[PDB]
Design an enzyme around this catalytic site. Structure first.
Site, PDB file in Angstrom:
ATOM      1  N   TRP A  11     -35.505   6.760  21.017  1.00 11.01           N
ATOM      2  CA  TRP A  11     -35.723   8.187  21.139  1.00 11.01           C
ATOM      3  C   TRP A  11     -36.901   8.588  22.021  1.00 11.01           C
ATOM      4  O   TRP A  11     -36.839   9.601  22.723  1.00 11.01           O
ATOM      5  CB  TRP A  11     -35.956   8.810  19.758  1.00 11.01           C
ATOM      6  CG  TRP A  11     -34.829   8.664  18.783  1.00 11.01           C
ATOM      7  CD1 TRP A  11     -33.501   8.946  18.997  1.00 11.01           C
ATOM      8  CD2 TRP A  11     -34.947   8.219  17.428  1.00 11.01           C
ATOM      9  NE1 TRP A  11     -32.790   8.696  17.850  1.00 11.01           N
ATOM     10  CE2 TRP A  11     -33.649   8.250  16.868  1.00 11.01           C
ATOM     11  CE3 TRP A  11     -36.018   7.797  16.629  1.00 11.01           C
ATOM     12  CZ2 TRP A  11     -33.392   7.858  15.552  1.00 11.01           C
ATOM     13  CZ3 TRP A  11     -35.767   7.425  15.316  1.00 11.01           C
ATOM     14  CH2 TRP A  11     -34.469   7.474  14.790  1.00 11.01           C
TER      15      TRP A  11
ATOM     16  N   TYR B 158     -36.139   0.200  16.350  1.00  5.14           N
ATOM     17  CA  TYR B 158     -35.197   0.462  15.277  1.00  5.14           C
ATOM     18  C   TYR B 158     -33.988  -0.465  15.489  1.00  5.14           C
ATOM     19  O   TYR B 158     -33.596  -0.732  16.622  1.00  5.14           O
ATOM     20  CB  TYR B 158     -34.674   1.898  15.289  1.00  5.14           C
ATOM     21  CG  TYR B 158     -35.556   2.910  14.590  1.00  5.14           C
ATOM     22  CD1 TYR B 158     -36.808   3.236  15.106  1.00  5.14           C
ATOM     23  CD2 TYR B 158     -35.142   3.541  13.427  1.00  5.14           C
ATOM     24  CE1 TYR B 158     -37.612   4.165  14.472  1.00  5.14           C
ATOM     25  CE2 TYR B 158     -35.939   4.471  12.787  1.00  5.14           C
ATOM     26  CZ  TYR B 158     -37.176   4.782  13.330  1.00  5.14           C
ATOM     27  OH  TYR B 158     -37.977   5.708  12.699  1.00  5.14           O
TER      28      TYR B 158
ATOM     29  N   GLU C  70     -39.710  -1.895   6.954  1.00  2.19           N
ATOM     30  CA  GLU C  70     -39.790  -1.322   5.636  1.00  2.19           C
ATOM     31  C   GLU C  70     -38.620  -1.513   4.700  1.00  2.19           C
ATOM     32  O   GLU C  70     -37.798  -0.584   4.500  1.00  2.19           O
ATOM     33  CB  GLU C  70     -39.999   0.223   5.778  1.00  2.19           C
ATOM     34  CG  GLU C  70     -41.468   0.565   5.922  1.00  2.19           C
ATOM     35  CD  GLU C  70     -41.771   2.044   6.085  1.00  2.19           C
ATOM     36  OE1 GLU C  70     -40.839   2.858   5.946  1.00  2.19           O
ATOM     37  OE2 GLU C  70     -42.948   2.366   6.351  1.00  2.19           O
TER      38      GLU C  70
ATOM     39  N   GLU D 139     -48.342   0.246   9.762  1.00  5.35           N
ATOM     40  CA  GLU D 139     -47.873   1.604   9.949  1.00  5.35           C
ATOM     41  C   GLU D 139     -48.490   2.561   8.923  1.00  5.35           C
ATOM     42  O   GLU D 139     -48.384   2.246   7.745  1.00  5.35           O
ATOM     43  CB  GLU D 139     -46.341   1.684   9.829  1.00  5.35           C
ATOM     44  CG  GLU D 139     -45.826   3.060  10.269  1.00  5.35           C
ATOM     45  CD  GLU D 139     -44.322   3.141  10.054  1.00  5.35           C
ATOM     46  OE1 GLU D 139     -43.586   2.391  10.716  1.00  5.35           O
ATOM     47  OE2 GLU D 139     -43.900   3.937   9.203  1.00  5.35           O
TER      48      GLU D 139
ATOM     49  N   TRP E  83     -48.952   5.706  13.079  1.00  6.62           N
ATOM     50  CA  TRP E  83     -47.632   6.256  13.429  1.00  6.62           C
ATOM     51  C   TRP E  83     -47.801   7.748  13.712  1.00  6.62           C
ATOM     52  O   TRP E  83     -48.261   8.466  12.817  1.00  6.62           O
ATOM     53  CB  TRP E  83     -46.707   6.037  12.223  1.00  6.62           C
ATOM     54  CG  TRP E  83     -45.296   6.532  12.426  1.00  6.62           C
ATOM     55  CD1 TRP E  83     -44.799   7.774  12.142  1.00  6.62           C
ATOM     56  CD2 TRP E  83     -44.181   5.790  12.941  1.00  6.62           C
ATOM     57  NE1 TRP E  83     -43.461   7.861  12.470  1.00  6.62           N
ATOM     58  CE2 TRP E  83     -43.063   6.647  12.965  1.00  6.62           C
ATOM     59  CE3 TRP E  83     -44.031   4.483  13.425  1.00  6.62           C
ATOM     60  CZ2 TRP E  83     -41.807   6.248  13.422  1.00  6.62           C
ATOM     61  CZ3 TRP E  83     -42.790   4.090  13.897  1.00  6.62           C
ATOM     62  CH2 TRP E  83     -41.693   4.963  13.877  1.00  6.62           C
TER      63      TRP E  83
ATOM     64  N   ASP F  34     -42.227  17.155  17.305  1.00  8.45           N
ATOM     65  CA  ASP F  34     -42.882  18.187  16.523  1.00  8.45           C
ATOM     66  C   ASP F  34     -42.859  17.865  15.040  1.00  8.45           C
ATOM     67  O   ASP F  34     -42.107  18.409  14.235  1.00  8.45           O
ATOM     68  CB  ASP F  34     -42.285  19.555  16.851  1.00  8.45           C
ATOM     69  CG  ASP F  34     -42.997  20.655  16.083  1.00  8.45           C
ATOM     70  OD1 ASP F  34     -44.228  20.551  15.887  1.00  8.45           O
ATOM     71  OD2 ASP F  34     -42.293  21.597  15.670  1.00  8.45           O
ATOM     72  N   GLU F  35     -43.712  16.925  14.674  1.00 10.14           N
ATOM     73  CA  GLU F  35     -43.886  16.494  13.286  1.00 10.14           C
ATOM     74  C   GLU F  35     -45.377  16.171  13.146  1.00 10.14           C
ATOM     75  O   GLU F  35     -46.031  15.768  14.122  1.00 10.14           O
ATOM     76  CB  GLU F  35     -42.989  15.334  12.879  1.00 10.14           C
ATOM     77  CG  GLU F  35     -43.284  14.018  13.588  1.00 10.14           C
ATOM     78  CD  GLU F  35     -42.243  12.957  13.271  1.00 10.14           C
ATOM     79  OE1 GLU F  35     -41.282  13.255  12.532  1.00 10.14           O
ATOM     80  OE2 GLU F  35     -42.381  11.814  13.762  1.00 10.14           O
TER      81      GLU F  35
HETATM   82  O1  LIG Z   1     -36.415  12.552  16.387  1.00  9.58           O
HETATM   83  C1  LIG Z   1     -35.904  11.250  16.172  1.00  9.58           C
HETATM   84  C2  LIG Z   1     -35.169  10.898  14.860  1.00  9.58           C
HETATM   85  O2  LIG Z   1     -36.175  10.969  13.834  1.00  9.58           O
HETATM   86  C3  LIG Z   1     -35.829  10.647  12.491  1.00  9.58           C
HETATM   87  O3  LIG Z   1     -36.943  10.856  11.631  1.00  9.58           O
HETATM   88  C4  LIG Z   1     -37.969   9.894  11.614  1.00  9.58           C
HETATM   89  C5  LIG Z   1     -39.379  10.609  11.715  1.00  9.58           C
HETATM   90  O4  LIG Z   1     -39.438  11.397  12.899  1.00  9.58           O
HETATM   91  C6  LIG Z   1     -40.546   9.576  11.621  1.00  9.58           C
HETATM   92  O5  LIG Z   1     -41.811  10.201  11.508  1.00  9.58           O
HETATM   93  C7  LIG Z   1     -40.363   8.570  10.454  1.00  9.58           C
HETATM   94  O6  LIG Z   1     -41.189   7.430  10.565  1.00  9.58           O
HETATM   95  O7  LIG Z   1     -39.051   8.033  10.351  1.00  9.58           O
HETATM   96  C8  LIG Z   1     -37.970   8.968  10.323  1.00  9.58           C
HETATM   97  C9  LIG Z   1     -36.650   8.158  10.218  1.00  9.58           C
HETATM   98  O8  LIG Z   1     -36.358   7.490  11.435  1.00  9.58           O
HETATM   99  C10 LIG Z   1     -34.673  11.648  12.059  1.00  9.58           C
HETATM  100  O9  LIG Z   1     -34.198  11.315  10.763  1.00  9.58           O
HETATM  101  C11 LIG Z   1     -33.484  11.665  13.085  1.00  9.58           C
HETATM  102  O10 LIG Z   1     -32.573  12.729  12.793  1.00  9.58           O
HETATM  103  C12 LIG Z   1     -34.019  11.900  14.531  1.00  9.58           C
HETATM  104  O11 LIG Z   1     -32.955  11.814  15.479  1.00  9.58           O
HETATM  105 CA   LIG Z   2     -42.826   4.619   7.277  1.00  8.67          CA
END
Ligand SMILES: OC[C@H]1O[C@@H](O[C@H]2[C@H](O)[C@@H](O)[C@H](O)O[C@@H]2CO)[C@H](O)[C@@H](O)[C@@H]1O
Ligand SMILES: [Ca+2]
Ligand SMILES: [Ca+2]
Ligand SMILES: [Ca+2]
Ligand SMILES: [Ca+2]
Ligand SMILES: [Ca+2]
Length: 302
Positions: free
Chosen positions: A36, A63, A136, A225, A259, A265-266
């Site tokens: 991504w 991933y 994990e 992480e 991480w 945008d998170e």
């Molecule tokens: O935007 C990419 C992808 O992200 C996924 O969420 C992530 C999150 O952004 C991250 O902070 C955390 O470590 O893991 C989660 C799970 O991978 C989300 O679920 C997808 O829909 C999205 O395409």
């Molecule tokens: Ca995690």
């Protein structure tokens, strides 16, 4: 300078140490999913992190699922790019087989063994490399005894065939939080570390005590992480508790990777949407999380 100074890393009584047997503490960034946000992982951004932030380790989060390596193994090219940049920049690099929705590492064991055989054959002679064989493990039916330890006992020898001494980080139960279970039934390989992951907005003293329990059993722990946000991703960042975790890790000299390096945008993201993928970021391009993490790495950099 980092790798040239410390060279071959090893574990001594649960401590990460350099080829002189002195303590070494790595601090750096993790990419987000390479499928991504792979554009943020390149020689230039890694150099900027090394030179402007002071990182000494970079984590390549590949991933397996979610459009990752299992469906599109080309993402592996992005792992190689990072490994080669780390070798060129003289810093350490973590090759992370990033399981998550595929909560039991045995789901893709065969593929994991093939991937690590290839990576260890290619880079096993470089001290820069660290292998992270199962990000994990999670879910109530995934435990150290039945699933994770046996998984590692099969993958480690694959790596050891090509690379006898580099560090290997092994995931633990409950999203790499159950280090105490692993610490009570450790792997025999001398150069192994157990992963511990946390969210500052969610985890506190109880998990710190758990980590201390594991450390008291002679286990080596790598915080491969950790986020400044809440696992829910609500309420922003929690830098107060994050600082408590920073100090705790400094006391115990625990290595860590934050991480993550993305403009998503998170709250846990280090960059603001639009940030330059090749680095040279302005202050306005960093998020509150990125601003704090950058400072934590700079403040201990030589
Ligand atoms: O935007 C990419 C992808 O992200 C996924 O969420 C992530 C999150 O952004 C991250 O902070 C955390 O470590 O893991 C989660 C799970 O991978 C989300 O679920 C997808 O829909 C999205 O395409
Ligand atoms: Ca995690
Ligand atoms: Ca280029
Ligand atoms: Ca082979
Ligand atoms: Ca080696
Ligand atoms: Ca088996």
């Amino acid at each position: 300078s980092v790798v040239e100074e410390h060279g071959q890393l090893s574990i001594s009584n649960g401590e990460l140490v350099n080829e002189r047997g002195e303590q070494v503490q790595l601090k750096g960034m993790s990419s987000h999913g390479l499928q991504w946000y792979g554009q943020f992982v390149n020689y230039e951004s890694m150099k900027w992190l090394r030179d402007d932030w002071g990182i000494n380790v970079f984590r390549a989060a590949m991933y397996t699922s979610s459009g990752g390596y299992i469906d599109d193994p080309s993402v592996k090219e992005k792992v190689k790019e990072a490994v080669e940049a780390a070798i060129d920049l003289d810093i350490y690099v973590i090759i992370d087989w990033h399981i998550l929705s595929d909560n039991d590492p045995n789901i893709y064991k065969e593929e994991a063994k093939d991937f690590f055989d290839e990576m260890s054959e290619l880079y096993g002679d470089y001290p820069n490399v660290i292998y992270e064989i199962a990000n994990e493990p999670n879910g109530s039916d995934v435990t150290w005894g039945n699933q994770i330890k046996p998984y590692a006992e099969e993958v480690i020898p694959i790596i050891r065939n090509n690379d006898p001494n580099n560090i290997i980080i092994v995931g633990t139960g409950t999203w790499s939080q159950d280090v105490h279970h692993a610490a009570d039934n450790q792997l025999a390989d001398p150069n192994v570390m157990y992963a511990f992951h946390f969210y500052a907005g969610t985890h506190g003293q109880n998990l710190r005590d758990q980590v201390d329990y594991a450390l008291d059993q002679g286990a080596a722990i790598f915080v491969s992480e950790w986020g400044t946000s809440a696992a829910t991703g609500d309420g922003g960042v929690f830098l107060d508790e994050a600082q408590v975790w920073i100090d705790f890790m400094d006391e115990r000299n625990l290595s860590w990777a934050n991480w993550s390096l993305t403009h998503k945008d998170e709250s846990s993201a280090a960059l603001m949407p639009g940030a330059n993928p090749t680095g040279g970021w302005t202050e306005a391009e960093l998020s509150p999380s990125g601003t704090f993490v950058r400072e934590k790495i700079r403040e201990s950099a030589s």
